């Protein structure tokens, strides 16, 4: 099996090339062995709407079964529904077969074992099992479980929408279409569907609400239909994008301001987690309502782990993953976050544009990417951490180098998956922005004078 598919927070590969049926079997075998090693024979299995889902999922299950695991096969479901299954069924283990928002031929695995979402060394240990044949052998079983209706009723039952809302819902032909439009309607909305047919060819836009270009159709439809809100789901439904009645894109850090106000209102002192790419206004806002803001590393597995360690009731990150523990289970779920958002907005007489525009806003630069090399990317950050001078900065080095000034901040970090440096800058003044930008440019140039700093 190829080492490259075993990533930091999941397994991901190309089904024609790096991810075969055979590989999927041995991955099931490694996962099952590890679940049993943690005392858990019971494993949920779900898949997204990808074309390779059927061929791959059978191998995954057989691998689990050949360990002696009791598999609950919940069929084609959003990623959060699989996480849900691994919280309400007998077992605390679950595997989601998904390629998230990637092109049609990508697929992969997101893995929970006895409550814990695997990351870093834990994933590499699965591969290690296959290389060493450190694998359990047994006569397992498969049970089919229909979990969607239960998930549906769980959310519907706990959400209390006041006013009615007209909502455009864009699933990008990903697996969220099996539930998000129907659930949102049931909450008390009129749903204008966009690309809600599940189709793993992805013949319209890619199901990635993080890129503005995949929100163009949503925005136009929200305006043309005079809708109250637009929602966009990623391919597997663990991320959601949001646009106001006027077409303004609301980024997750701003979404978290609304959610944190709400969660903290009922839970004084609640820990709230966000990543190093989030606006410094979120920190102040959380603290001002009496919450405990916790800045953490980028990721999904990392934020999820940090939530468990801190007792946090809410987390989010800039890629659109939002994690509710309050009234929920603590995993990322775009569909439930959408429900929670609709609940709050339905209780405000103002339109969604005004609800969000009321919060303070800094001047933000669009995220910046600098292509370096795979050999240098971590070394550049290490060099900044060693040599860089940032003045009275409030320096954070959890994930690259973030520096918080009184009126703004800057971040530089190495992409885990690509040979790229990622930067963000935000300030209250356009003067401040160009000053923080100036400092970072200088410090990168002091590491390598030949580095292409495009700001
Ligand atoms: O890897 P990073 O640190 O650049 O991080 C970026 O890429 C990752 C992998 O993307 P993909 O699944 O499409 O390969 C994403 O999970 C993450 O949200 C994104 O910010
Ligand atoms: Zn996703």
Curated annotation (Swiss-Prot):
Entry keyword Phosphoprotein: yes
Residues reported in the UniProt entry to bind Mg(2+): 100, 234, 236, 238
Region feature (Topological domain 1): 5-134
Residue numbers binding alpha-D-mannose 1-phosphate: 9, 300, 317-321, 413-417
Region feature Topological domain 3, mapped onto this chain: 252-356
Residues recorded with modification Phosphoserine: 100
Residues at the catalytic site: 12 (proton donor), 100 (non-phosphorylated intermediate), 321 (proton acceptor)
Functional description taken from the UniProt entry: Highly reversible phosphoryltransferase. The phosphomannomutase activity produces a precursor for alginate polymerization, the alginate layer causes a mucoid phenotype and provides a protective barrier against host immune defenses and antibiotics. Also involved in core lipopolysaccaride (LPS) biosynthesis due to its phosphoglucomutase activity. Essential for rhamnolipid production, an exoproduct correlated with pathogenicity. Required for biofilm production.
Protein name: Phosphomannomutase/phosphoglucomutase
Organism: Pseudomonas aeruginosa (strain ATCC 15692 / DSM 22644 / CIP 104116 / JCM 14847 / LMG 12228 / 1C / PRS 101 / PAO1)
Gene that encodes the chain: algC
């Amino acid at each position: 099996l190829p080492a490259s598919i075993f990533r930091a927070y999941d397994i991901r590969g190309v089904v024609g090339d790096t991810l075969t049926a055979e590989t999927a079997y041995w991955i099931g075998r490694a996962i099952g062995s590890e679940s049993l090693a943690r005392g858990e024979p019971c494993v949920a299995v779900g898949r997204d709407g990808r074309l390779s889902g059927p061929e791959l999922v059978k191998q995954l299950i057989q691998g689990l079964v050949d360990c002696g695991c009791q598999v609950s096969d919940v069929g084609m479901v959003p990623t959060p529904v699989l996480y849900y299954a691994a919280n309400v069924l007998e077992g605390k283990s679950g595997v989601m077969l998904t390629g998230s928002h990637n092109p049609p031929d990508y697929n992969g695995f997101k893995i929970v074992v006895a409550g814990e979402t695997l990351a870093n060394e834990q994933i590499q240990a699965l591969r290690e099992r296959i290389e060493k044949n450190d694998l359990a052998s047994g006569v397992g079983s498969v049970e089919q479980v229909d979990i969607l209706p239960r998930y549906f009723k769980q959310i519907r039952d706990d959400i209390a929408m006041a006013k009615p809302m007209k909502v455009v819902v864009d699933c990008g032909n990903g697996v969220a279409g099996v539930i998000a439009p129907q659930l949102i309607e049931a909450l008390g909305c009129s749903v204008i569907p966009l690309y809600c047919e599940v189709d793993g060819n992805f013949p319209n836009h890619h199901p990635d609400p993080g890129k503005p270009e995949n929100l163009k159709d949503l925005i136009a439809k929200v305006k043309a239909e005079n809708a109250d809100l637009g929602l966009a789901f990623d391919g597997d439904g663990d991320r959601v994008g949001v646009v106001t009645n006027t077409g303004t894109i609301i980024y997750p850090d701003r979404l978290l301001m609304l959610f944190a106000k709400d969660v903290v209102s009922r839970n004084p002192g609640a820990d709230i987690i966000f990543d190093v790419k989030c606006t410094r206004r979120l920190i102040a806002l959380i603290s001002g309502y009496g919450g405990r803001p916790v800045m953490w590393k980028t990721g999904h597995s990392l934020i999820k782990k940090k939530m468990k360690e801190t007792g946090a009731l809410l987390a989010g990150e800039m890629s659109g993953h939002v994690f509710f523990k309050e009234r929920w289970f603590g995993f990322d779920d775009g569909i439930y976050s959408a429900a929670r958002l609709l609940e709050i907005l339905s209780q405000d007489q103002r339109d969604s544009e005004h609800v969000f525009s009321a919060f303070p806003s800094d001047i933000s630069t669009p995220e910046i990417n600098i292509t370096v090399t795979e050999d240098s990317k971590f070394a550049i950050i290490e060099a900044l951490q060693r040599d860089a001078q940032w003045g009275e900065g409030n320096i954070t080095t959890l994930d690259g180098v973030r520096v918080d000034y009184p009126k703004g901040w800057g971040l530089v970090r190495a992409s885990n998956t690509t040979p790229v440096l990622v930067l963000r800058f935000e300030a209250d003044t356009e003067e401040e922005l160009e000053r923080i930008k100036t400092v970072f440019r200088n410090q990168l140039k002091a590491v390598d004078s030949s580095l292409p700093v495009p700001f």
